[PDB]
Amino acid sequence: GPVIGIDLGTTYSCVGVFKNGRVEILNNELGNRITPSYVSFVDGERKVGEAAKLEATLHPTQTVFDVKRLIGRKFDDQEVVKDRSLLPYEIVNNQGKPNIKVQIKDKDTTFAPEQISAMVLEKMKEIAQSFLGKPVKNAVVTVPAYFNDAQRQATKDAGTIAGLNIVRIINEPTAAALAYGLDKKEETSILVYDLGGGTFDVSILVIDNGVFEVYATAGNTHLGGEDFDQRVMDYFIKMFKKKNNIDLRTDKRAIQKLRKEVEIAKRNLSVVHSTQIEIEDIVEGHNFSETLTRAKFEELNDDLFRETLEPVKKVLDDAKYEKSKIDEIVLVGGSTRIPKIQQIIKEFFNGKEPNRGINPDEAVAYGAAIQAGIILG
Ligand SMILES: C[C@@]1(O)[C@H](O)[C@@H](CO)O[C@H]1n1ccc2c(N)ncnc21
Ligand SMILES: C[C@@]1(O)[C@H](O)[C@@H](CO)O[C@H]1n1ccc2c(N)ncnc21
């Protein structure tokens, strides 16, 4: 039967199939090739993906996301204590493990992280099933190289709940290397720089006669595109207050409208130098109208961009690598489209050009789908 490829990411998933010799990264019901890893439990209905993320503004305690930060961990782990302080939905201690508590028709309902991940995997499965016109029972699913056996098993368990035999778990750096078609012959050292929506990962991946090994991995679990958006939000909230005596933080709907336009502006500024951010009646009777330049975008985030170099030094240190030992730098995640990111990496590596693919946001799912093709022969 068919084997699909799923990138089960912290903020977004992505599904691809290998069909007729091509990888097809599939569109969700709204025509997006990535789907927010969100599930909402509002008013007796369950939503998954973009419809769920839209519930976050008015129902923050019922909108579950970022479960990948909890899956396979213990409630008292330093990382989970930190995530409980950040996340708005209730996290409870079920026999030493974090569970998610929401209300369904007012009733307290408690989920394991793998049960929420299963709902995201089910939606990806359904996309593939309708694209292929066939039932899907098998998948390649990706994990971070740092995932321990409990974290990988919990991910496999989410697959089983979703009706997926996970026939292979592959690490995100291997998936990226397959997507970029990196030469499997002889010995090559690759830096995989993976800057996503919520998390930053960097890995030294050695490819030797077709065998993939991650020699070192480091990162920052709270550094991504969403942080760059927040820096811009903070600046424009302050400016709007100065100019209008309105603090937009006092209206959650106003913040949601602004956040949507800021995200688009950021993406625009990866190609142009100036963009307009416009919301009619951001509150009744008051329009929002600003220009954001690429230079101000970079100024607002430059310390965050330079923070991505601390993990790169650590993995070069762990592996005992000179910078020159890296043969190829490959960029994964849509945030790697930011020109300043590319410049800072190139300068760190004394002028070595990083390899950007055309669509770094889909590279992991693309590689998962290639792995699915390889396993079938
Ligand atoms: C959608 C994103 O904001 C998100 O934060 C992340 C998910 O990988 O990727 C970003 N992303 C996606 C595309 C993109 C862009 N052209 N310029 C900056 N960031 C970009
Ligand atoms: C908010 C203000 O009532 C302020 O209190 C007053 C004195 O500076 O003038 C208005 N103000 C301040 C700045 C500003 C602006 N850029 N566009 C409209 N109104 C503006």
Author numbering: 28 to 404
The authors write:
One class of druggable targets is the endoplasmic reticulum (ER) resident molecular heat shock chaperone GRP78, which is also referred to as Immunoglobulin Binding Protein (BiP), an HSP70-like stress response protein implicated in the cellular unfolded protein response (UPR). GRP78 is essential in the maintenance of ER homeostasis, where it facilitates proper protein folding, mitigating physiological and pathological damages that may cause an accumulation of misfolded proteins and ER stress. GRP78 is structurally divided into two distinct domains: the nucleotide-binding domain at the amino terminus followed by a flexible linker to the substrate-binding domain at the carboxyl-terminus. ATP hydrolysis and ADP/ATP exchange within the NBD of GRP78 play an essential role in the chaperone activity.
It is evident that HP3 interacts with pfGRP78-NBD, but lacks hydrogen bonding with Arg364 due to the deaza substitution. In other nucleoside analogue-bound pfGRP78-NBD structures, a hydrogen bond is clear present between N7 and Arg364. In addition, the 2′ methyl substituent of HP3 helps orient the 2′ hydroxyl group to form a hydrogen bond with hLys296 and has hydrophobic interactions with hGlu293 conserved in pfGRP78-NBD. The finding that the hydrogen bonding and hydrophobic contacts are conserved and indistinguishable between the P. falciparum and the human orthologue suggest that neither the deaza modification at the N7 position nor the 2′ methylation enhance selectivity for pfGRP78-NBD.
